[PDB]
Amino acid sequence: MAHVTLQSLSNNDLCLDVYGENGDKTVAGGSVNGWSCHGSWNQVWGLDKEERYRSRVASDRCLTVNADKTLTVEQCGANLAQKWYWEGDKLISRYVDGNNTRYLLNIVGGRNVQVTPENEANQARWKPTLQ
Amino acid sequence: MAHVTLQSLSNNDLCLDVYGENGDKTVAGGSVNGWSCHGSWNQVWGLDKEERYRSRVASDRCLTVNADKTLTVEQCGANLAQKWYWEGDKLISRYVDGNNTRYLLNIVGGRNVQVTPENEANQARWKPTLQ
Amino acid sequence: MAHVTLQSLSNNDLCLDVYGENGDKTVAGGSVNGWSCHGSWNQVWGLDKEERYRSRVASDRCLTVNADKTLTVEQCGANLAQKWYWEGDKLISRYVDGNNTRYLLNIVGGRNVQVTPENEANQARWKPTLQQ
Amino acid sequence: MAHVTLQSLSNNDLCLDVYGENGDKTVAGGSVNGWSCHGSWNQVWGLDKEERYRSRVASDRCLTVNADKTLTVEQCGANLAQKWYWEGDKLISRYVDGNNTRYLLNIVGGRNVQVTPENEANQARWKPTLQ
Amino acid sequence: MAHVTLQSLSNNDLCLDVYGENGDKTVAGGSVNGWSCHGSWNQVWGLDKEERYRSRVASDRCLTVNADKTLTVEQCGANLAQKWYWEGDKLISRYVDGNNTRYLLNIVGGRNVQVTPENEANQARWKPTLQ
Amino acid sequence: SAMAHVTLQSLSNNDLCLDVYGENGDKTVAGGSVNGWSCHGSWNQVWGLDKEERYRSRVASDRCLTVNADKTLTVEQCGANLAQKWYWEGDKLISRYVDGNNTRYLLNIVGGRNVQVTPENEANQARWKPTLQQVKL
Amino acid sequence: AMAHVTLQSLSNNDLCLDVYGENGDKTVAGGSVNGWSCHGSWNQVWGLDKEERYRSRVASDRCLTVNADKTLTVEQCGANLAQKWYWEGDKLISRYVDGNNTRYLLNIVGGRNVQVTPENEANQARWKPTLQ
Ligand SMILES: CC(=O)N[C@@H]1[C@@H](O)[C@H](O[C@@H]2O[C@H](CO)[C@H](O)[C@H](O)[C@H]2O)[C@@H](CO)O[C@H]1O
Numbered sequence: 001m002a003h004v005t006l007q008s009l010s011n012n013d014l015c016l017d018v019y020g021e022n023g024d025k026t027v028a029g030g031s032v033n034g035w036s037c038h039g040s041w042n043q044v045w046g047l048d049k050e051e052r053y054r055s056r057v058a059s060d061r062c063l064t065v066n067a068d069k070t071l072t073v074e075q076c077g078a079n080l081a082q083k084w085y086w087e088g089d090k091l092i093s094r095y096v097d098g099n100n101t102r103y104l105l106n107i108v109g110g111r112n113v114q115v116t117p118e119n120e121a122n123q124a125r126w127k128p129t130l131q
Numbered sequence: 132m133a134h135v136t137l138q139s140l141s142n143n144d145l146c147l148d149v150y151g152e153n154g155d156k157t158v159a160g161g162s163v164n165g166w167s168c169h170g171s172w173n174q175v176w177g178l179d180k181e182e183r184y185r186s187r188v189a190s191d192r193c194l195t196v197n198a199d200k201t202l203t204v205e206q207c208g209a210n211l212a213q214k215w216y217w218e219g220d221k222l223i224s225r226y227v228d229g230n231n232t233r234y235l236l237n238i239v240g241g242r243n244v245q246v247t248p249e250n251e252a253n254q255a256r257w258k259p260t261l262q
Numbered sequence: 263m264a265h266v267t268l269q270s271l272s273n274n275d276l277c278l279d280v281y282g283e284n285g286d287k288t289v290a291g292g293s294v295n296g297w298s299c300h301g302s303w304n305q306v307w308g309l310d311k312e313e314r315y316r317s318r319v320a321s322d323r324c325l326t327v328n329a330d331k332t333l334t335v336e337q338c339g340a341n342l343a344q345k346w347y348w349e350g351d352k353l354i355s356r357y358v359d360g361n362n363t364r365y366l367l368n369i370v371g372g373r374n375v376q377v378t379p380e381n382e383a384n385q386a387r388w389k390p391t392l393q394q
Numbered sequence: 395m396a397h398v399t400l401q402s403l404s405n406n407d408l409c410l411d412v413y414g415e416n417g418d419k420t421v422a423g424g425s426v427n428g429w430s431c432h433g434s435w436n437q438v439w440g441l442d443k444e445e446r447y448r449s450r451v452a453s454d455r456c457l458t459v460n461a462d463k464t465l466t467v468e469q470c471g472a473n474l475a476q477k478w479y480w481e482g483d484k485l486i487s488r489y490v491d492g493n494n495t496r497y498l499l500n501i502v503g504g505r506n507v508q509v510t511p512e513n514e515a516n517q518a519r520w521k522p523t524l525q
Numbered sequence: 526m527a528h529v530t531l532q533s534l535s536n537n538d539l540c541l542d543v544y545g546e547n548g549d550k551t552v553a554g555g556s557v558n559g560w561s562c563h564g565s566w567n568q569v570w571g572l573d574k575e576e577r578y579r580s581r582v583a584s585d586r587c588l589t590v591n592a593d594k595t596l597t598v599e600q601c602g603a604n605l606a607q608k609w610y611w612e613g614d615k616l617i618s619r620y621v622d623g624n625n626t627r628y629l630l631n632i633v634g635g636r637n638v639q640v641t642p643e644n645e646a647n648q649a650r651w652k653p654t655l656q
Numbered sequence: 657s658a659m660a661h662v663t664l665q666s667l668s669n670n671d672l673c674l675d676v677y678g679e680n681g682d683k684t685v686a687g688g689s690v691n692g693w694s695c696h697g698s699w700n701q702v703w704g705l706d707k708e709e710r711y712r713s714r715v716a717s718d719r720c721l722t723v724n725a726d727k728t729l730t731v732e733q734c735g736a737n738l739a740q741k742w743y744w745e746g747d748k749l750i751s752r753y754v755d756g757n758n759t760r761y762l763l764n765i766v767g768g769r770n771v772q773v774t775p776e777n778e779a780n781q782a783r784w785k786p787t788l789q790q791v792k793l
Numbered sequence: 794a795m796a797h798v799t800l801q802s803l804s805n806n807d808l809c810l811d812v813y814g815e816n817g818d819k820t821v822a823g824g825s826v827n828g829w830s831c832h833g834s835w836n837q838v839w840g841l842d843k844e845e846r847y848r849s850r851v852a853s854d855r856c857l858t859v860n861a862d863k864t865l866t867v868e869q870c871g872a873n874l875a876q877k878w879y880w881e882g883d884k885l886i887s888r889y890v891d892g893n894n895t896r897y898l899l900n901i902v903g904g905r906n907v908q909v910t911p912e913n914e915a916n917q918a919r920w921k922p923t924l925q
């Protein structure tokens with residue numbers, strides 16, 4: 001299982017980053033957004049065999065789509081909200097709801113990163129980059 | 132043969148699951164429906180050379196389409212009602228009748244899982260996930 | 263020589279079956295129709311180098327189209343009425359006549375199996391299933 | 395060189411067969427027509443390097459197209475009337491004339507086999523069958 | 526180098542043939558035309574790496590297009606009038622002139638063989654046949 | 657695949673290679689100008705595409721071809737910015753640089769020996785050939 | 794180790810690209826290149842190197858070069874696109890650029906005169922690199 005950064009190709013310098021809550025990166029429910037690439041622990045990810053992106057911040061922290069379509073890291077489970085797959089430079093969640101669309105990892109403005117309906121995902125290019 | 136869980140891609144957390152009879156998940160004629168994924172032995176399946184999805188609850192328990200399009204596990208035989216094949220993420224039964232349609236594994240309501248005529252099957256996406 | 267059962271995909275449980283005559287499956291001239299699958303010697307077939315389906319019931323017994331479009335097993339010969347080939351899940355005879363048509367292995371009611379014009383063969387899907 | 399019978403797929407039992415003359419199946423100029431399959435020396439053929447179909451009845455005996463489009467076996471030579479080639483199940487002569495057509499090996503009624511202009515050849519399917 | 530006869534497929538028995546002078550097939554400048562196939566040395570040819578068809582009648586005798594479109598054998602040189610290439614069963618000269626047409630080896634009547642402008646070459650099928 | 661040392665020669669100008677000019681004759685300088693020059697193959701004309709899609713100059717360690725905000729080119733210490741990432745489509749050499757203008761930027765000769773990146777639809781002298789180059793240590 | 798080739802025209806029954814040189818001396822830098830009947834001596838033998846230059850065998854370091862007036866010479870080998878050549882079928886194309894918006898093709902322009910010509914006007918521009 002390769003350790004990578006998830007670097008945007010839609011922004012000259014933005015990597016997927018665990019902000020956390022109040023300086024602590026390791027907390028469950030910690031927010032995930034974007035930040036300049038420094039490759040520190042809170043910017044390193046690994047894709048496990050259940051298609052979860054595991055954070056290197058702490059054991060059992062997974063990239064998780066929330067109801068409001070923000071991103072957090074959470075304990076690892078079997079929910080589709082923690083499953084991801086690549087189509088080219090697009091990183092796509094398996095999360096489903098009533099809207100009949102796929103959700104793509106996407107910059108929504110400034111350093112904010114969420115998931116967005118596929119047709120409205122305009123800053124949604126990423127590169128898994130070997131550490 | 133490879134043992135898998137059959138997890139829905141149409142529902143954020145649902146696995147094909149042997150309900151059984153009165154809590155007992157090993158009896159022939161036991162019911163099959165959906166449940167949150169946990170991977171225990173009554174959510175584990177294997178596709179044999181005769182195209183039957185054998186359940187890991189006990190020997191001789193094959194996923195079977197009934198006359199009323201509901202699902203059980205039964206002793207393994209040659210009926211097409213026990214035969215399955217994949218097309219992409221659709222899991223299709225060989226079962227035939229007067230209606231001249233193919234039937235697909237489908238979530239009809241909530242945690243109820245049946246087979247459904249292909250043209251009306253809208254929660255019928257599945258992924259065979261290795262255990 | 264690849265041994266198979268010929269199971270219908272148009273019927274939930276039917277295989278091509280040598281009924282035989284008077285009890286005996288061994289006999290030449292014996293009838294062929296459908297039965298539930300058990301894979302015993304009289305439901306197993308093998309396609310030889312001359313495109314004949316030879317039954318495991320006994321030596322020298324090939325699936326044969328009759329003029330009544332009924333099916334039997336007979337002594338092996340050169341005749342086209344004994345030649346078969348696949349097109350997807352259709353099993354087609356090389357038998358020719360005036361109707362300018364191809365004949366398909368087909369279920370023609372209940373457990374009865376015969377060859378039927380391609381245009382009219384509504385239950386003619388088959389799956390040759392490897393056996394061992 | 396593979397020894398084959400030349401069996402029609404347009405008739406339920408007919409193989410290309412050396413008749414001979416008044417009995418003698420080795421006579422040069424002997425007739426070739428159709429007959430029930432039995433795979434004796436006079437029904438076996440080999441396609442040689444110069445595209446000739448040589449009969450097993452004797453040395454130096456090729457399948458030959460005549461002026462009146464019937465068929466005999468003759469001493470082997472260079473003439474295009476003794477050259478044959480396959481296109482699918484059609485067996486085609488290299489014979490040329492003023493009619494601007496290819497000539498196909500073809501059943502012209504009963505057991506009479508001859509060659510026929512391509513557009514007119516309705517019983518012209520053949521299978522070279524390894525004896 | 527493969528020795529071949531150049532047999533016509535547009536005539537039932539015609540091979541490309543060095544006529545020579547006075548029965549001597551070896552003479553430089555000797556005429557080339559058609560004859561019935563017998564595959565003696567004046568009907569055997571070899572295509573060399575410079576695209577010349579060399580005759581076996583003697584060394585240094587290449588098939589040559591003359592300005593009046595007749596064919597001779599001559600000493601081998603670099604002229605396009607001696608270069609030949611195949612497209613299907615057409616044998617095409619590299620000869621050029623102001624007419625902007627390719628010239629094809631063609632039977633122009635009886636046993637007369639010449640090169641003919643492509644669009645009029647109606648007896649221009651050939652087969653190179655290993656000796 | 658091992659990093660191949662190449663020159664980057666224009667196919668839009670009869671003799672122009674991408675060249676580190678440096679500053680005051682010092683070709684090794686961080687932030688030194690890159691432009692065009694006639695081809696001679698010395699270290700300040702030799703480049704290598706690394707695993708992070710950066711074109712490293714042979715002039716010295718840690719020098720990558722970089723798009724500046726005014727679209728001129730320099731060599732700078734190597735990092736993660738898209739302004740140092742490059743990829744080929746045929747004979748076009750394209751920057752991963754992004755801004756608000758809805759365009760890809762291509763390596764392009766903008767006049768004489770000046771080389772910049774230019775919006776794709778205006779990039780008229782933008783053909784290049786990476787040419788394998790022997791380098792002596 | 795470059796393959797020896799002559800560059801033989803396919804638009805003329807006997808013409809090869811040929812170093813004429815200067816004052817009878819075929820080795821000289823600046824020497825003229827035009828056409829001649831094919832004999833395959835060294836002033837007609839060429840090799841395509843790894844920089845896409847056609848090197849002549851008359852001497853070390855003599856490359857086929859397009860001049861600004863579109864005539865051809867041999868010159869010291871360097872990086873100029875005026876010395877680079879590539880094939881598309883039987884067309885031999887220069888990488889030379891100028892303000893005219895055209896590719897230039899090796900072309901016979903009358904008699905034994907060989908130059909490069911704009912693609913759209915090059916009517917005697919077929920060639921074959923012929924292995925010696
Ligand atoms: C308590 C507190 O705010 N501490 C901050 C750290 O959060 C901060 O680390 C950075 O945090 C951002 C999110 O705002 C992002 O996650 C960066 O990757 C991470 O390095 C640190 C550096 O700015 O300053 C502390 O004071």
Ligand SMILES: CC(=O)N[C@@H]1[C@@H](O)[C@H](O[C@@H]2O[C@H](CO)[C@H](O)[C@H](O)[C@H]2O)[C@@H](CO)O[C@H]1O
Pocket residue numbers: 148149150151153154155166173
């Ligand atoms: C007697 C009785 O009802 N016992 C139940 C178990 O059935 C139950 O196990 C779960 O059963 C559901 C079906 O309703 C499904 O098959 C689950 O996968 C299975 O684990 C257990 C947990 O709910 O509770 C017992 O009391």
Ligand SMILES: CC(=O)N[C@@H]1[C@@H](O)[C@H](O[C@@H]2O[C@H](CO)[C@H](O)[C@H](O)[C@H]2O)[C@@H](CO)O[C@H]1O
Pocket residue numbers: 542543544545547548549560567
């Ligand atoms: C002296 C003389 O004319 N001898 C001839 C032979 O040339 C001739 O050979 C045949 O000639 C034809 C061309 O006319 C062709 O080249 C044949 O391949 C070649 O065999 C021979 C046979 O007719 O007769 C002699 O009289």
Ligand SMILES: CC(=O)N[C@@H]1[C@@H](O)[C@H](O[C@@H]2O[C@H](CO)[C@H](O)[C@H](O)[C@H]2O)[C@@H](CO)O[C@H]1O
Pocket residue numbers: 675676677678680681682693700
């Ligand atoms: C101090 C000074 O100006 N020295 C110059 C060198 O810069 C120069 O080298 C050439 O510089 C050009 C850029 O102008 C390009 O980088 C060439 O590759 C490089 O060789 C040299 C030759 O022009 O002259 C020195 O005096």
Ligand SMILES: CC(=O)N[C@@H]1[C@@H](O)[C@H](O[C@@H]2O[C@H](CO)[C@H](O)[C@H](O)[C@H]2O)[C@@H](CO)O[C@H]1O
Pocket residue numbers: 811812813814816817818829836
């Ligand atoms: C001094 C002088 O003119 N000498 C000539 C040779 O140049 C000449 O060689 C031929 O020259 C032509 C071009 O004119 C072409 O390059 C031929 O390949 C080459 O052989 C030679 C033969 O004509 O005669 C000498 O006198």
